[PDB]
Amino acid sequence: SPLDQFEIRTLFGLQSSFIDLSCLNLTTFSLYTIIVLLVITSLYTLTNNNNKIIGSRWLISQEAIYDTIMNMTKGQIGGKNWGLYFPMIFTLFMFIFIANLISMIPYSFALSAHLVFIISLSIVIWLGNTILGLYKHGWVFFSLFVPAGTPLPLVPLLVIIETLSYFARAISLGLRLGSNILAGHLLMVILAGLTFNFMLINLFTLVFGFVPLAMILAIMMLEFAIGIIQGYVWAILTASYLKDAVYLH
Amino acid sequence: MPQLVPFYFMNQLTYGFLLMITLLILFSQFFLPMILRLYVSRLFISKL
Amino acid sequence: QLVLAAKYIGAGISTIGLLGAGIGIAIVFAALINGVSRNPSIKDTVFPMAILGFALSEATGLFCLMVSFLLLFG
Amino acid sequence: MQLVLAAKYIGAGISTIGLLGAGIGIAIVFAALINGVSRNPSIKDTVFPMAILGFALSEATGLFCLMVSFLLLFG
Amino acid sequence: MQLVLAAKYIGAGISTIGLLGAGIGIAIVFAALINGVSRNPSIKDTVFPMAILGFALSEATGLFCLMVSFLLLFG
Amino acid sequence: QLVLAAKYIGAGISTIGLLGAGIGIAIVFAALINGVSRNPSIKDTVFPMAILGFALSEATGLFCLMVSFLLLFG
Amino acid sequence: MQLVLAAKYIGAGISTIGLLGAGIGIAIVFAALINGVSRNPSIKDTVFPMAILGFALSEATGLFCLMVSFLLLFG
Amino acid sequence: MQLVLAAKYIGAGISTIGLLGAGIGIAIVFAALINGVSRNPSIKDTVFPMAILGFALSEATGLFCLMVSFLLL
Amino acid sequence: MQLVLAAKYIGAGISTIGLLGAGIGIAIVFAALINGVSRNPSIKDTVFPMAILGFALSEATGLFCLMVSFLLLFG
Amino acid sequence: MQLVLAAKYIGAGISTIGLLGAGIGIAIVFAALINGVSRNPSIKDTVFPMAILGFALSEATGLFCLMVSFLLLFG
Amino acid sequence: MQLVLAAKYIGAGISTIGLLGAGIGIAIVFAALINGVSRNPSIKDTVFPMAILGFALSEATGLFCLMVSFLLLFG
Amino acid sequence: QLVLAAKYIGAGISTIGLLGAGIGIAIVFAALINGVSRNPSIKDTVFPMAILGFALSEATGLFCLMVSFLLLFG
Amino acid sequence: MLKRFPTPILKVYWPFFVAGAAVYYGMSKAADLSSNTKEFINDPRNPRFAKGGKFVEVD
Amino acid sequence: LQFALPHETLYSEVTQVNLPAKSGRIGVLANHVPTVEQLLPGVVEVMEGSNSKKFFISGGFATVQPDSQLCVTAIEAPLESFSENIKNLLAEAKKNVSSSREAAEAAIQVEVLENLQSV
Amino acid sequence: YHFMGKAIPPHQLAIGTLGLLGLL
C-alpha cells in the first residue's frame, strides 16, 4: 500500500447523540488547513518590518506574486471592471501555491490531492460563473453557445457539443490539479519504496547505489515545477472562464 | 480509490470552505491593500 | 459475473481515444504560437478561434471519457 | 446471455478507438485556420465558414463512430 | 449460438477503428484548402472543387470502413 | 462453430488498414491543392499523375477490403 | 472473484496508453514555443502564458486517462 | 484443428495492417512529386522515373504483407 | 490467486507502451532546440532552459506510465 | 501441438506489422530525393547513391520482421 | 506454475513496443542536427553536445521499457 | 504445452518496435538528402553523422530483435 | 498593525456563495447516501453509531 | 537583360541559376517560386543547356519574378580567371585590423576573405 | 445575426435545440 500517505486521522475529536456535530472537528486535513492559514498570515504580518516603506527582502516575494497575478488577470478579463474579481483570482492562487509547497516536506500531507475538496471547489466556481452570467445578461447568456458567423444548418450540432464542453468545465478544472498532485506524490513514494528494497540486498548495491538516489532527487526537483505550474494554471483558467461568463465572447 | 472516499467528506468541505471565505475576506480587506498602500505611498513620494 | 469484469476491460479500452485529444490541443496551440510569432498583431484577432478549436477538440476527446464512465458506472 | 452481454461492453469499448481521428482532425483544420489568418488578416470572412464546414465534415466520422458505439451498447 | 453472436458485436467494435483515417483525411484536405485560399485568394473557384473531390472519396473510404461494421453487426 | 466466430473477428480486424488509404488520398490532394494554389498554370500537367496515385493508393486499401470480403464468405 | 480483479488490473493496464497522447502533446507545444521564440526574440513575454496554458490544458487529457486507471486500480 | 483453423483466420486478419504503410507512402512519394513539378515544371521527365521507382518499391513492401496474408489462406 | 498474478504481469506489460510518447517527445523538443539555434545562435541562454523544462514535463508523463507498471509488478 | 501451431500462426500474423515502417520509410527517402532534385537539379548523381543506400538499409530493417515471421511459420 | 510463467513471457513480449519511440526519436534529433549544420556550418561544435544529450535522454525512455521487459523475464 | 506457445506469441509481439528504426533511419537519410541538396559542400562533414544515426537507431531496433530472439530460444 | 479597509466582498461575490451553499447541501446528501453502502456500513467511525442505532450487519 | 553590377551589367535566356542566398545556396529553374533573398558574399553560376560559368560576388539581392524572370543584383565581380598572393597579403592585413567600429569592419573582411580562399 | 426563411432575425437560436433535447 504505497498510498497510505493520504490517510485522514481524527485528533481532537467531538461527538454527541443529539446532533451530528462530527462535521467540524480538528483533523489532519483540518490541522493542515490551520497551518496553511497561519503560513499565509505569516507571509504578510511579520514579513513587514514595522510597516516600513522600503519593503524588506521577504516582501519582494509577496510583491512579485501580487504583480504576476495582477498582470495576468489584466490580460484576461481586461474590461471596464477587472479588479472587482481580483481578490478571488489571488486567493485561488495562494491556497494552491502554499498547499503544494507544504506537501513537499517529507513527513507531511497533500491538501490538494483530495479530489472531493478540489472537485467541489471547481463545481463551486462553475456554478458561480453560470449564476453570475445569467444574472448579468438575462436570456441572451446562451449566446455564448454559438461561436461566430457560422452556417445555420450545422448550428444545433455546434450548440450541443459546445454545451457538453461547457459542463465538462465543472469537473475538468479540479481534476487536472488533483491528478497532477496525486500522481506526483504517488510517483515519489513508489520510487522511494523501490530504491529502499534495492539497497537491502547484498553489500555491492550500497556501492554505486547513488544513481537511483540521484533519480529521486531529480524527480523532487521536477515536483516543485509541477506543483507551482498547476497553481498558476488554475488561476489562468478561472480567469478565462470569468472572461467568458462576464463578457459574451 | 479507497483513501479519498471516506466519511470525512463534510469535514474536508467544511474546513475548506471556511478557509476559503476566511482567506477571501482576509486577503481582500487586509493584505492586498497593505501592499497597495505601499504602492500609493511610493508613487506619492515619487511625485512629491 | 463475467459482465462485471468485462465492463472494466471496456472502460480501459474506451479511454484510449484521449490520445487524439492531447495531440489535438497541442497542434492547435502550436499553430497559435507560430501565428503569433510570425504576425505579432493577430493575437486578439485569432485567439478566440484557438479557444473555440480547443473546446471542440476536447469535447470530441471527451466522448470517449463519457463512454468510459457509462461503462464503469452504468 | 452473459457472454453476449459482456461482448456488448467490450465492443462498445473497442468502438471508440477510431474517435481520436476526429480529435486530431478538428485540430488540423483549426491549425491551418490560425496559420492562414496569420499570413492574411483580410481573408477571415471567406476561410472561417469554410473552416467550420471542414470541422463538421470531419466531425461526421467521429459521430458515426460514437453512433456505432451507442448501437452496440444499447441494442 | 452465443459464440458467434458475441463475435459479430466484437468485430463491429473493431471495424470502427478505420474511421480515424477519414477523420484525419478530411482535415488534411481542408487544411491544404485553407492554406491555398489564404495564400492565393483569387484561385478559390478553381481550387475548391478539387477539395470537394478529395473529400468525397476520402469520406467514401470512411464509409468503406463503416459498411463492414454494418455488415457484421446485423448478419 | 468457433471458426465462424474467429472468421468474423478477423474480417473485422482486416478493416484497420483502410486508414492508410484514407490518409493517403488526403496527402495526394493536399499536394495537388498546394501546387495549384502556388502555380496556377501547371494544373493540367500536375492533375493526371495525381489521379494515378489516387487510384493506386485507393487500390492499396482495396487490398484490405478484398481480404475482408475473402474472409467474410470462404 | 479472481476474474473481477484480473480484468480490473488488465483494464488498468490498458488505460495508461493515453499518456503517449500527452507526451507528444507537451512536446509539440514546447517545440512551437522554441521555434516561435527563436524566430522572434521579442515575443517571449507574450507567448509564454499561451505556452503554459497549452501545456497543462493539453496534459489534462492524459491525466483523465490516468484517473480512469486509478479508479480501476484502487476503486 | 478447429482452434487452428480459427487462428489461421485471426492471423490473416492481423496480417493486413502493414498495407497502411504503402497506402501512406505512395502518397508521400507522389506528394513530393507534385510539389517538385509544381515548383519547377522542366524537371518533370527527370524526376518522374524516381517517382515510378518509389511507387514500385512501396507497392512491393505492401505486397510482402499481402503475400504473408495469402500464405495464411 | 494465480490468475490475478498472471494478469498483473500482462498489465505491467501493457503499461509500458506509454513510454513511446516520451521517447518521441524529448526528441521533438530537442529537435526544435537544434533548429532554433541554427536559425539564431544568439538566443541560446534564453531558449535552452525552456528546452530543459519541456524535457522535464514530458519525462513526467513518461514516469506516470512507468509507475503503473511498477505497481502492477510488485504492489 | 495444435495450440502451439495456432500460436505460431498468430505470431506470424503479428510479426508483419513492422513492415509498415519500411513502407513509410522508403517513401520518406525517395520523397526527400525528389525534393532534392527539384531544389537542386545538378546534384542528382551525388545524391542518388545515398538514396539507394537508404532504400537498402530501410528495406533490411523491414525485412527483419519478415524473416522473424518466416521463422515462426517454418522454424 | 505454467499459467503465470507463460503470461510473464507474454508481458515481456508486449513491453518492448514502446522502444519504437526511442527509435524514431534519436533519429529525429540527429535529423534536426543534419538540417541545422546544413544551414550554418559554424555551429556544429556548439550544437552536437546537445544532440548527443538528446540521444542519451531519448535512449533513457527506451531502456526503461527494456528494463521492464527484462524484469518480466528474469524476475 | 502453453509456455512454448506463449514464447512464439511474445516473439511475434516484440518485432513491432522495428518500425521505429524503419521510419527513423529514413528521417535521418531524408535530412541528409535535404542537407546535401541545399549545401553540397558540407557532405563529407555531415555523412558520418548520418552513419552514426543509422547505427544508433539500428541498435534501438536490434534491442527489440534480440528480445525477440531471447523469447525464441533462451 | 493592519488597518482594515471596507472592500466590497458581498455585492460582488454573491453567486459564488450561493453556489457554495448549494454544493454544501448536495454533498451533504451525497455523503449520507454514500455512508450506507455495503462496503461502509461497518466502519465504526461513521456518525451513525454515536446516535442510537447499531449494526445492521446483514450483507 | 537581368543581372547587374552598377558599373558593369552582365546577363540576358537561362536554363539554371545557382545563387548563394541568405539561408544557404539555392537553385532557380525553368519555372520557380517567386522569391526575394539577400545575396550572401559568395560564388554564383549561369547555365545555357550544359554551360558552366561561375562568378564570385560581393552580395546583394535576388528576386525571382511571377512573370518568371530572375533578377540578380550585386556590386563587384570570370572565376579563378579573376582572383592567391593578391588574396594572401590582403588576408594578413585583414586579420591584423580585427584586433583594433573600425575593427568591426575587419570582421566583415575575415568571412569574405576566408570564403574566397575556397575557389 | 441569422436570417431563416426571410423572417425576423432570430436571437441566438441556442435555447431551442436545448429545449428540443430536453423533452426526450
Swiss-Prot record, chain B:
The chain crosses the membrane at residues 13-32. It is a single-pass membrane protein. It comes from the Eukaryota. Keywords: ATP synthesis, CF(0), Hydrogen ion transport, Ion transport, Membrane, Mitochondrion, Transmembrane, Transmembrane helix, Transport. The keyword Metal-binding does not apply. GO terms for cellular component: mitochondrial inner membrane; mitochondrion; proton-transporting ATP synthase complex. One of its GO terms (molecular function) is proton transmembrane transporter activity. It is found in: Mitochondrion membrane. GO terms for biological process: proton motive force-driven ATP synthesis. Mitochondrial membrane ATP synthase (F(1)F(0) ATP synthase or Complex V) produces ATP from ADP in the presence of a proton gradient across the membrane which is generated by electron transport complexes of the respiratory chain. F-type ATPases consist of two structural domains, F(1) - containing the extramembraneous catalytic core and F(0) - containing the membrane proton channel, linked together by a central stalk and a peripheral stalk. During catalysis, ATP synthesis in the catalytic domain of F(1) is coupled via a rotary mechanism of the central stalk subunits to proton translocation. Belongs to the ATPase protein 8 family. This is ATP synthase protein 8. The lineage of its organism: Eukaryota, Fungi, Dikarya, Ascomycota, Saccharomycotina. The gene is ATP8.
From Swiss-Prot, chains C, F, L:
The gene is OLI1. One of its GO terms (biological process) is proton motive force-driven ATP synthesis. It comes from Saccharomyces cerevisiae (strain ATCC 204508 / S288c) (Baker's yeast). Keywords: CF(0), Formylation, Hydrogen ion transport, Ion transport, Lipid-binding, Membrane, Mitochondrion, Transmembrane, Transmembrane helix, Transport. It is found in: Mitochondrion membrane. GO terms for cellular component: cytosol; mitochondrial inner membrane; mitochondrial intermembrane space; mitochondrion; proton-transporting ATP synthase complex; proton-transporting two-sector ATPase complex, proton-transporting domain. It is a multi-pass membrane protein. The chain crosses the membrane at residues 13-33, 51-71. This is ATP synthase subunit 9, mitochondrial. Mitochondrial membrane ATP synthase (F(1)F(0) ATP synthase or Complex V) produces ATP from ADP in the presence of a proton gradient across the membrane which is generated by electron transport complexes of the respiratory chain. F-type ATPases consist of two structural domains, F(1) - containing the extramembraneous catalytic core and F(0) - containing the membrane proton channel, linked together by a central stalk and a peripheral stalk. During catalysis, ATP synthesis in the catalytic domain of F(1) is coupled via a rotary mechanism of the central stalk subunits to proton translocation. Gene3D superfamilies: F1F0 ATP synthase subunit C (1.20.20.10). The record marks E58 as: Reversibly protonated during proton transport. Changing T45L: In strain: DS400/A3 and KL14-4A. CDD domains: ATP-synt_Fo_c_ATP5G3.
UniProtKB/Swiss-Prot annotation, chain M:
The chain crosses the membrane at residues 9-25. GO terms for molecular function: proton transmembrane transporter activity. Pfam families: ATP-synt_J. It comes from the Eukaryota. GO terms for cellular component: mitochondrial inner membrane; mitochondrion; proton-transporting ATP synthase complex. The keyword Mitochondrion applies. InterPro entries: ATP_synth_F0_jsu. One of its GO terms (biological process) is mitochondrial proton-transporting ATP synthase complex assembly. Keywords: ATP synthesis, CF(0), Hydrogen ion transport, Ion transport, Membrane, Mitochondrion, Transmembrane, Transmembrane helix, Transport. Its main location: mitochondrion. Present with 6540 molecules/cell in log phase SD medium. F-type ATPases have 2 components, CF(1) - the catalytic core - and CF(0) - the membrane proton channel. In yeast, the dimeric form of ATP synthase consists of 17 polypeptides: alpha, beta, gamma, delta, epsilon, 4 (B), 5 (OSCP), 6 (A), 8, 9 (C), d, E (Tim11), f, g, h, i/j and k. PANTHER family: ATP SYNTHASE SUBUNIT J, MITOCHONDRIAL. This is ATP synthase subunit J, mitochondrial.
Curated annotation (Swiss-Prot), chain N:
Transmembrane segments: none annotated. GO terms for molecular function: proton-transporting ATP synthase activity, rotational mechanism. It comes from the Eukaryota. It is found in: Mitochondrion; Mitochondrion inner membrane. Its main location: mitochondrion. GO terms for cellular component: mitochondrial inner membrane; mitochondrion; proton-transporting ATP synthase complex. Belongs to the ATPase epsilon chain family. F-type ATPases have 2 components, CF(1) - the catalytic core - and CF(0) - the membrane proton channel. CF(1) has five subunits: alpha(3), beta(3), gamma(1), delta(1), epsilon(1). CF(0) has three main subunits: a, b and c. Mitochondrial membrane ATP synthase (F(1)F(0) ATP synthase or Complex V) produces ATP from ADP in the presence of a proton gradient across the membrane which is generated by electron transport complexes of the respiratory chain. F-type ATPases consist of two structural domains, F(1) - containing the extramembraneous catalytic core, and F(0) - containing the membrane proton channel, linked together by a central stalk and a peripheral stalk. During catalysis, ATP turnover in the catalytic domain of F(1) is coupled via a rotary mechanism of the central stalk subunits to proton translocation. This is ATP synthase subunit delta, mitochondrial. It comes from Saccharomyces cerevisiae (strain ATCC 204508 / S288c) (Baker's yeast). The chain holds residues 34 to 158 of 160 of the full protein.
